[PDB]
UniProtKB/TrEMBL annotation:
It comes from Human enterovirus 71. It comes from the Viruses. Belongs to the picornaviruses polyprotein family. This is Genome polyprotein. Interacts with protein 3CD. Residues 2-180 form the Peptidase C3 domain. Coiled coil: none annotated. It is found in: Host cytoplasmic vesicle membrane; Host nucleus; Virion. Protein 3AB: Localizes the viral replication complex to the surface of membranous vesicles. Together with protein 3CD binds the Cis-Active RNA Element (CRE) which is involved in RNA synthesis initiation. Acts as a cofactor to stimulate the activity of 3D polymerase, maybe through a nucleid acid chaperone activity. Protein 2B: Plays an essential role in the virus replication cycle by acting as a viroporin. Creates a pore in the host reticulum endoplasmic and as a consequence releases Ca2+ in the cytoplasm of infected cell. In turn, high levels of cytoplasmic calcium may trigger membrane trafficking and transport of viral ER-associated proteins to viroplasms, sites of viral genome replication.
């Protein structure tokens, strides 16, 4: 098996988890220690269902930029037994585009699912169901409901978290390493 498949399957084993909130099914990315990230609209509460058990949430942070604009990412500290494998080194230091990225999804409904979104380009502002959002990127792929939280990856780099689409295109919140320092 080659390196790209190996890397994505290793994410799925160690960092990319099937979850459920009151809003439904999402992919969760565990980044390090007991810190994970989810799309803001998943609206995690005091507890979250992770794979096979209810986990308590000790803290949630909704990220906004200096202008007070939604970034569509919530950082959760979990009451988990184990630390996540630390993947902050794979998250670029600034929001980065990519070529021929793969969207990796892991939900009870869409388990271990690989979506060939293709090139990922700068997009910036995005009106997400009436919510103004910054620091997004775009792929010309018809992504669908249930894919939010999906991890946008390319060549060993973890660069986005899927957050929406319009039936022709998909958008992610961009990831940068400072979010998890
Ligand atoms: C993932 C969450 C989900 O499944 O919720 C159940 C509806 C989902 C992925 C997209 C659905 C269709 N295609 C997808 O890939 N995300 C959402 O539903 C968010 C909202 C959207 O994606 C909306 N799209 C846009 O607003 C938009 C704008 C442009 C230029 O292109 N698309 C559509 C449903 C209209 C959920 C969300 C996020 C943030 C919010 F504040 C509210 C809702």
């Amino acid at each position: 098996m080659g390196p790209s498949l190996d890397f994505a399957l290793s994410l799925l084993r160690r960092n990319v988890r099937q979850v459920q909130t009151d809003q439904g099914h999402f992919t969760m990315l565990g980044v390090r220690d007991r810190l994970a990230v989810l799309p803001r609209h998943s609206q995690p509460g005091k507890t979250i269902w992770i794979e096979h058990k209810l986990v308590n949430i000790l803290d949630a942070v909704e990220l906004v930029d200096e202008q007070g604009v939604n970034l569509e990412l919530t950082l959760i500290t979990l009451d988990t037994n184990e630390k996540f494998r630390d993947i902050t080194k794979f998250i670029p230091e600034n929001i980065s585009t990519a070529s021929d990225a793969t969207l990796v999804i892991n939900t009870e409904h869409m388990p271990s699912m690989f979506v060939p979104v293709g090139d990922v380009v700068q997009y910036g502002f995005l009106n997400l169901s009436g919510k103004p959002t910054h620091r997004t990127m775009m792929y010309n792929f018809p992504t669908k409901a249930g894919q939010c939280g999906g991890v946008v990856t390319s060549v060993g780099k973890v660069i986005g978290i899927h957050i929406g689409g319009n039936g022709r295109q998909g958008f992610c919140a961009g990831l940068k390493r400072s979010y998890f320092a």
